[PDB]
Design a protein around this ligand. Structure first.
Ligand SMILES: [Mg+2]
Ligand SMILES: [Mg+2]
Ligand SMILES: [Mg+2]
Ligand SMILES: [Mg+2]
Ligand SMILES: [Mg+2]
Ligand SMILES: [Mg+2]
Ligand SMILES: [Mg+2]
Ligand SMILES: [Mg+2]
Ligand SMILES: [Mg+2]
Ligand SMILES: [Mg+2]
Ligand SMILES: [Mg+2]
Ligand SMILES: [Mg+2]
Ligand SMILES: [Mg+2]
Ligand SMILES: [Mg+2]
Ligand SMILES: [Mg+2]
Ligand SMILES: [Mg+2]
Ligand SMILES: [Mg+2]
Ligand SMILES: [Mg+2]
Ligand SMILES: [Mg+2]
Ligand SMILES: [Mg+2]
Ligand SMILES: [Mg+2]
Ligand SMILES: [Mg+2]
Ligand SMILES: [Mg+2]
Ligand SMILES: [Mg+2]
Ligand SMILES: [Mg+2]
Ligand SMILES: [Mg+2]
Ligand SMILES: [Mg+2]
Ligand SMILES: [Mg+2]
Ligand SMILES: [Mg+2]
Ligand SMILES: [Mg+2]
Ligand SMILES: [Mg+2]
Ligand SMILES: [Mg+2]
Ligand SMILES: [Mg+2]
Ligand SMILES: [Mg+2]
Ligand SMILES: [Mg+2]
Ligand SMILES: [Mg+2]
Ligand SMILES: [Mg+2]
Ligand SMILES: [Mg+2]
Ligand SMILES: [Mg+2]
Ligand SMILES: [Mg+2]
Ligand SMILES: [Mg+2]
Ligand SMILES: [Mg+2]
Ligand SMILES: [Mg+2]
Ligand SMILES: [Mg+2]
Ligand SMILES: [Mg+2]
Ligand SMILES: [Mg+2]
Ligand SMILES: [Mg+2]
Ligand SMILES: [Mg+2]
Ligand SMILES: [Mg+2]
Ligand SMILES: [Mg+2]
Ligand SMILES: [Mg+2]
Ligand SMILES: [Mg+2]
Ligand SMILES: [Mg+2]
Ligand SMILES: [Mg+2]
Ligand SMILES: [Mg+2]
Ligand SMILES: [Mg+2]
Ligand SMILES: [Mg+2]
Ligand SMILES: [Mg+2]
Ligand SMILES: [Mg+2]
Ligand SMILES: [Mg+2]
Ligand SMILES: [Mg+2]
Ligand SMILES: [Mg+2]
Ligand SMILES: [Mg+2]
Ligand SMILES: [Mg+2]
Ligand SMILES: [Mg+2]
Ligand SMILES: [Mg+2]
Ligand SMILES: [Mg+2]
Ligand SMILES: [Mg+2]
Ligand SMILES: [Mg+2]
Ligand SMILES: [Mg+2]
Ligand SMILES: [Mg+2]
Ligand SMILES: [Mg+2]
Ligand SMILES: [Mg+2]
Ligand SMILES: [Mg+2]
Ligand SMILES: [Mg+2]
Ligand SMILES: [Mg+2]
Ligand SMILES: [Mg+2]
Ligand SMILES: [Mg+2]
Ligand SMILES: [Mg+2]
Ligand SMILES: [Mg+2]
Ligand SMILES: [Mg+2]
Ligand SMILES: [Mg+2]
Ligand SMILES: [Mg+2]
Ligand SMILES: [Mg+2]
Ligand SMILES: [Mg+2]
Ligand SMILES: [Mg+2]
Ligand SMILES: [Mg+2]
Ligand SMILES: [Mg+2]
Ligand SMILES: [Mg+2]
Ligand SMILES: [Mg+2]
Ligand SMILES: [Mg+2]
Ligand SMILES: [Mg+2]
Ligand SMILES: [Mg+2]
Ligand SMILES: [Mg+2]
Ligand SMILES: [Mg+2]
Ligand SMILES: [Mg+2]
Ligand SMILES: [Mg+2]
Ligand SMILES: [Mg+2]
Ligand SMILES: [Mg+2]
Ligand SMILES: [Mg+2]
Ligand SMILES: [Mg+2]
Ligand SMILES: [Mg+2]
Ligand SMILES: [Mg+2]
Ligand SMILES: [Mg+2]
Ligand SMILES: [Mg+2]
Ligand SMILES: [Mg+2]
Ligand SMILES: [Mg+2]
Ligand SMILES: [Mg+2]
Ligand SMILES: [Mg+2]
Ligand SMILES: [Mg+2]
Ligand SMILES: [Mg+2]
Ligand SMILES: [Mg+2]
Ligand SMILES: [Mg+2]
Ligand SMILES: [Mg+2]
Ligand SMILES: [Mg+2]
Ligand SMILES: [Mg+2]
Ligand SMILES: [Mg+2]
Ligand SMILES: [Mg+2]
Ligand SMILES: [Mg+2]
Ligand SMILES: [Mg+2]
Ligand SMILES: [Mg+2]
Ligand SMILES: [Mg+2]
Ligand SMILES: [Mg+2]
Ligand SMILES: [Mg+2]
Ligand SMILES: [Mg+2]
Ligand SMILES: [Mg+2]
Ligand SMILES: [Mg+2]
Ligand SMILES: [Mg+2]
Ligand SMILES: [Mg+2]
Ligand SMILES: [Mg+2]
Ligand SMILES: [Mg+2]
Ligand SMILES: [Mg+2]
Ligand SMILES: [Mg+2]
Ligand SMILES: [Mg+2]
Ligand SMILES: [Mg+2]
Ligand SMILES: [Mg+2]
Ligand SMILES: [Mg+2]
Ligand SMILES: [Mg+2]
Ligand SMILES: [Mg+2]
Ligand SMILES: [Mg+2]
Ligand SMILES: [Mg+2]
Ligand SMILES: [Mg+2]
Ligand SMILES: [Mg+2]
Lengths: 171, 119, 72, 109
RNA sequence: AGACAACCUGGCGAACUGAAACAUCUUAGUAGCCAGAGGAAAAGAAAGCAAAAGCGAUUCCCGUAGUAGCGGCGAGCGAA
RNA sequence: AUCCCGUGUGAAUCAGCAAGGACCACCUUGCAAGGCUAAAUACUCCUGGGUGACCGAUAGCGAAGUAGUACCGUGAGGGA
RNA sequence: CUGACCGCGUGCCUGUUGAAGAAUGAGCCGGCGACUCAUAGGCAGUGGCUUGGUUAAGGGAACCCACCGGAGCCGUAGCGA
RNA sequence: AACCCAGAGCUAGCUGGUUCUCCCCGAAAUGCGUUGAGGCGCAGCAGUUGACUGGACAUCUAGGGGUAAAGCACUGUUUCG
RNA sequence: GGCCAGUGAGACGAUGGGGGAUAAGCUUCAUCGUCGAGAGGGAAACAGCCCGGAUCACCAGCUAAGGCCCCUAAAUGACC
RNA sequence: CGGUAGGGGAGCGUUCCGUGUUAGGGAGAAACGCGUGCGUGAGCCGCGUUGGACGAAGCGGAAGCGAGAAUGUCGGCUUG
RNA sequence: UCGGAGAGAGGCUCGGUGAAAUAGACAUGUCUGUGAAGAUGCGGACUACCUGCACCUGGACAGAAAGACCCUAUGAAGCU
RNA sequence: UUCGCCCAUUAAAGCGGUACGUGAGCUGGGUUCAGAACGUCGUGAGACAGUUCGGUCCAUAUCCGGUGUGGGCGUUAGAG
């Protein structure tokens, strides 16, 4: 506990008289100051610089759509062979503590670090490097189904007409 | 928690006032004046503890001058001092002034030594 | 319900932060009068520059929720 | 009629001098017309800015008989002075920093 | 029928101020006035949320979040 | 978009109608144009208990005595 | 305590390039009288945990407080409109 | 452009004031922009805290230059022959 | 680099100059010194000239600038 | 080891709370007045032919916490 | 011109009652010099016993607060 | 009005400083304050180093300074 400055008591003490505001003018006056981003009336830095690319128009900002995990973390943790990784078992060992936004998210696996064990992994996506190193080590990659996109019947007829075409052609 | 200033003021003031005893007039009464007067007192005091060291040397030198000038027609403070030094004596000016008043015969002797050797 | 500081929105559409924590901005002057600016210039005015240390104060003071390393 | 118009000094003039060191690309001279002419290992710019192509010492010469040209030559820096005043004092500073740091945690009581 | 501190509901409804001027904006649907009722009032039993998985009248607190957004894209305002 | 009002026009009944942030298709959800309802929440002219790193007569209520008194003001009001 | 006479000695504050100023302010004395609080952001100093840290409202033998309360929040991936 | 009360502790880049002691260090009155000029933003120059460093004070050498002096080779100017 | 201030009216003096009348204790720039924010001594008194940068005590000593008839410290010194 | 603006370090005191319904106190507390006492100072420690009932030190905590300036402000009393 | 005398109400003395603006402290000379460039207060000289009373108004940049004039303020209001 | 012109004299009808010397001694203008009118400028509110008529400066002398007039004390015993 360091004792506080009490301004305006004596000069011998500390900031006495003026209190360390020097002589007069606007900074030494009582009350709300001037806005923090404001330079004198010269056009402020933040104004004379152009708005950031996407933001500037109202294109929606970029947001993380997966909880990224590398293989580093999976190595460090206490996984014995046969163990199921998934999402749940990474909350269990606490390597991922997801918040609201992250609660609602899926999982993704990114290659970094070299795994040694056979583990059974369940996630909604992998990077290429990831599943390369994983299938190299002898780990079984269970990819989980995303939630179905609702498509009306007509566009099903179209996307199926496609598949019929490819199929009649190859066969 | 409300805090009246209470006695903390009047002690300070009183202790100041004690200083200013025997100042003529309102320098011994009004606190506000007394303050200033205290500072100035302390200040002159400090100044004249320094003046002092100058002043007594002034004095002593003067007395020495008079004490010597009695002897020779041509003799001075300056001449004397110069001779004290080329004779290697250490007596400083307080001592020669005090021996000048309090033991005048002594200073005559000293002068006779200085002359004999300068002869 | 206290009062929490408000992000100055007109500064947060301008500046942002890189992964290592330094502030960056766009460069000024590509919107019009391009024909008469040489292509070399036009390229220079298209990149992202780290904000000049001097301004960091004002910037920082208006974007209290921006995570920023000043390299201490 | 009425005066009082003028211009910021353009910052022209010799940036690196004779027998100093120059990086590649480093500007030696910003001039209006060509008061200096490009010598060897040295490029000239559109505004007649003279700049270096090579690391090395820059040297001014008589283009002849009147004018002047600047050129850059590669130097050799082998002579690192092993035992000399420069080295001695700099070493001293190093050693004193190390010593005075080691006798801190190296303090009893 | 009149009386009734604050709270509440409805009706009328500013200005200084902030924006380093000011007119859009802010102050603020604040103060003030008028009317009304209660120990609370108002709201309230999905023509509601949500998103392809689900909830199950209203009010209040924490949080989401100073986020998405709004804005002489300025000062500022600001959800679900 | 959703919501609610001036002026003018002006539908459909469940094979419907509305909502899902212009609008159209599809699917999901819901049933406007009749009412009424407790609690959790706000407040102190107050009543009864309790506590106080609250005041102690220039403080604490304006008011520890004729205190909204004396006095001032035509009056609203000021006010020891 | 008094004070013969000698020496030195241009009230205080404010504010100014600069004042003893004939620059402002105070009749004198005693009281009252000013960088405060709430909430957030940054930084520093101290602790606590680092088997990552922490709980909010809420509940509590009235308060405090034991013990709960992981919803949240901060740190673990960036680049890109 | 009445008065009283209320918004209202309006607002005042302005003037006044801002209270205990000792120790260490210690400026500036410049540049740029400003509806700016007695205000403010950044820079310059304090303090405190860290990280790198090896200088500073002297001594000699080397660079480029177009001032003082000097000159009439150019540009003007000028007297007489 | 971090955290976090004041300052952004300067004054004269030396030197280089511009404006002005090679007027101004005028004005405006450039390289320096002092004052500002500096007490002590010399300058009769006397911010900015000269000496000197005040931790403190001493009724000690040596000097700087400047001085040695009396006021008032030191020579009513010496030789031209 | 001069110092204004200004920054940093180290302290003193006031009222209150914890220890504490403390030690001490009508064999005289706070306060008031005094000191050949001790501190770099803020102050401390001691003393009373005053005063008449409270209240230290230590180790900690909190502020309505220190005044000579506001043509401050309220009382008291001068000058003329 | 060029003033004179007189009467009343004061002024003046004595008894009774008894204010006010003002006021840092005042032990409050002149000349000259200095100095923020007009000094009782700094220097050098000069002059001055202490203290009343009546008169006089040269000084104290005398006294009665924002300077009506000039400028400033991104002040206020009235008016076109 | 500074300036200046004239009349009649006169020895002559000097020029300057003293904050217009002198407004806490007096009085006119001037700071053309608010009313009004003329010329002129302005669409206009209004304006004028244009003119015109009207238009509030107070004062009990504290100190110094002054003109007078006393007391005290000194003048080495006291007096006229
Ligand atoms: Mg504090
Ligand atoms: Mg401090
Ligand atoms: Mg002060
Ligand atoms: Mg400060
Ligand atoms: Mg001030
Ligand atoms: Mg300032
Ligand atoms: Mg303000
Ligand atoms: Mg405000
Ligand atoms: Mg703001
Ligand atoms: Mg755009
Ligand atoms: Mg992004
Ligand atoms: Mg997270
Ligand atoms: Mg109390
Ligand atoms: Mg107080
Ligand atoms: Mg004495
Ligand atoms: Mg990151
Ligand atoms: Mg474009
Ligand atoms: Mg800053
Ligand atoms: Mg040029
Ligand atoms: Mg080319
Ligand atoms: Mg009724
Ligand atoms: Mg009624
Ligand atoms: Mg009722
Ligand atoms: Mg408005
Ligand atoms: Mg307005
Ligand atoms: Mg405004
Ligand atoms: Mg404004
Ligand atoms: Mg209820
Ligand atoms: Mg109801
Ligand atoms: Mg139901
Ligand atoms: Mg129903
Ligand atoms: Mg709807
Ligand atoms: Mg919706
Ligand atoms: Mg409506
Ligand atoms: Mg209709
Ligand atoms: Mg129908
Ligand atoms: Mg609709
Ligand atoms: Mg629905
Ligand atoms: Mg229906
Ligand atoms: Mg409807
Ligand atoms: Mg219904
Ligand atoms: Mg109802
Ligand atoms: Mg009383
Ligand atoms: Mg009272
Ligand atoms: Mg009392
Ligand atoms: Mg004396
Ligand atoms: Mg004297
Ligand atoms: Mg001035
Ligand atoms: Mg004065
Ligand atoms: Mg001044
Ligand atoms: Mg002044
Ligand atoms: Mg006062
Ligand atoms: Mg006064
Ligand atoms: Mg007064
Ligand atoms: Mg206080
Ligand atoms: Mg503040
Ligand atoms: Mg706070
Ligand atoms: Mg904080
Ligand atoms: Mg820690
Ligand atoms: Mg709790
Ligand atoms: Mg509870
Ligand atoms: Mg509770
Ligand atoms: Mg009015
Ligand atoms: Mg206010
Ligand atoms: Mg308001
Ligand atoms: Mg205003
Ligand atoms: Mg120093
Ligand atoms: Mg300077
Ligand atoms: Mg201003
Ligand atoms: Mg600055
Ligand atoms: Mg520094
Ligand atoms: Mg050369
Ligand atoms: Mg040369
Ligand atoms: Mg040449
Ligand atoms: Mg020349
Ligand atoms: Mg020549
Ligand atoms: Mg020629
Ligand atoms: Mg020629
Ligand atoms: Mg400037
Ligand atoms: Mg200036
Ligand atoms: Mg200033
Ligand atoms: Mg000068
Ligand atoms: Mg000069
Ligand atoms: Mg020249
Ligand atoms: Mg000449
Ligand atoms: Mg000149
Ligand atoms: Mg000047
Ligand atoms: Mg010199
Ligand atoms: Mg200053
Ligand atoms: Mg200095
Ligand atoms: Mg000096
Ligand atoms: Mg001197
Ligand atoms: Mg010097
Ligand atoms: Mg020294
Ligand atoms: Mg020193
Ligand atoms: Mg000597
Ligand atoms: Mg002598
Ligand atoms: Mg001689
Ligand atoms: Mg110091
Ligand atoms: Mg200071
Ligand atoms: Mg104590
Ligand atoms: Mg006590
Ligand atoms: Mg106490
Ligand atoms: Mg007991
Ligand atoms: Mg006692
Ligand atoms: Mg007590
Ligand atoms: Mg004590
Ligand atoms: Mg103690
Ligand atoms: Mg008793
Ligand atoms: Mg205790
Ligand atoms: Mg207070
Ligand atoms: Mg007072
Ligand atoms: Mg009074
Ligand atoms: Mg009296
Ligand atoms: Mg008569
Ligand atoms: Mg008569
Ligand atoms: Mg009468
Ligand atoms: Mg009488
Ligand atoms: Mg009076
Ligand atoms: Mg006298
Ligand atoms: Mg002078
Ligand atoms: Mg004079
Ligand atoms: Mg004198
Ligand atoms: Mg004197
Ligand atoms: Mg003197
Ligand atoms: Mg007079
Ligand atoms: Mg008179
Ligand atoms: Mg005076
Ligand atoms: Mg302005
Ligand atoms: Mg305005
Ligand atoms: Mg004659
Ligand atoms: Mg006259
Ligand atoms: Mg005359
Ligand atoms: Mg007069
Ligand atoms: Mg007239
Ligand atoms: Mg006309
Ligand atoms: Mg008349
Ligand atoms: Mg008198
Ligand atoms: Mg007299
Ligand atoms: Mg007499
Ligand atoms: Mg007599
Ligand atoms: Mg006698
Ligand atoms: Mg006698």
């Amino acid at each position: 506990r360091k004792k506080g400055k009490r301004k305006g008591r004596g000069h011998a003490a500390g900031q006495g008289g003026s209190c360390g505001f020097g002589m007069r003018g606007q900074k030494s006056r009582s009350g709300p100051g001037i806005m923090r981003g404001f330079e004198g009336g010269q056009m402020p830095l933040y104004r004379r610089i152009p708005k950031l690319r996407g933001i500037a128009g109202g294109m929606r900002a970029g947001l993380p759509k997966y909880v990224p995990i590398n293989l580093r973390d999976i190595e460090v943790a206490g996984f014995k062979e046969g163990e199921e990784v998934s999402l749940e078992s990474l909350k269990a060992k606490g390597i991922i503590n997801p918040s609201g936004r992250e609660r609602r998210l899926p999982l993704k696996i990114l290659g970094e670090g070299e795994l040694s064990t056979k583990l059974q992994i369940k996630a909604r996506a992998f990077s290429g490097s990831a599943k390369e190193k994983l299938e190299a080590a002898g780990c079984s990659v269970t990819v989980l189904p995303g939630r179905k996109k609702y498509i009306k019947e007509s566009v099903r007829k179209n996307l199926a007409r496609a598949d019929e075409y490819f199929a009649k052609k190859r066969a | 928690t409300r805090v009246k200033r209470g006695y903390i003021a009047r002690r300070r003031r009183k202790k100041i006032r004690f200083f200013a005893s025997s100042f003529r007039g309102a320098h011994s009464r009004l606190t506000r004046t007394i303050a200033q007067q205290k500072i100035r007192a302390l200040v002159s005091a400090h100044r004249d503890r320094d003046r002092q060291k100058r002043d007594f040397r002034r004095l002593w030198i003067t007395r020495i001058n008079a004490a010597i000038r009695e002897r020779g027609v041509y003799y001075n403070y300056s001449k004397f001092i110069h001779d004290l030094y080329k004779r290697q004596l250490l007596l400083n000016r307080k001592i020669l002034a005090q021996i000048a008043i309090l033991n005048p015969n002594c200073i005559y002797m000293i002068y006779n030594e200085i002359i004999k050797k300068e002869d | 319900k206290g009062y929490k500081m408000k992000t100055h929105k007109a500064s947060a559409k301008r500046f942002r932060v890189t992964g290592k924590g330094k502030i960056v901005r766009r460069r000024a002057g590509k919107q019009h009068l391009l024909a008469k600016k040489n292509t070399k210039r036009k390229n220079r005015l298209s990149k992202l520059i780290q904000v000049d240390r001097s301004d960091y104060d004002n910037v920082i003071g208006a974007l209290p929720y921006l995570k920023v390393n000043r390299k201490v | 009629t009425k005066n009082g118009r003028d211009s910021k000094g353009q910052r022209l003039g010799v940036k690196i001098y004779g027998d100093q060191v120059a990086k590649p690309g480093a500007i030696i001279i910003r001039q209006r017309g060509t008061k200096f002419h490009p010598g060897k290992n040295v490029g000239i710019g559109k505004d007649h800015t003279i700049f270096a192509l090579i690391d090395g010492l820059v040297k001014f010469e008589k283009y002849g008989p009147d004018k002047k040209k600047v050129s850059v030559y590669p130097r050799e820096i082998q002579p690192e002075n092993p035992n000399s005043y420069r080295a001695r004092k700099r070493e001293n500073f190093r050693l004193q920093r190390e010593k005075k740091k080691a006798r801190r945690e190296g303090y009893s009581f």
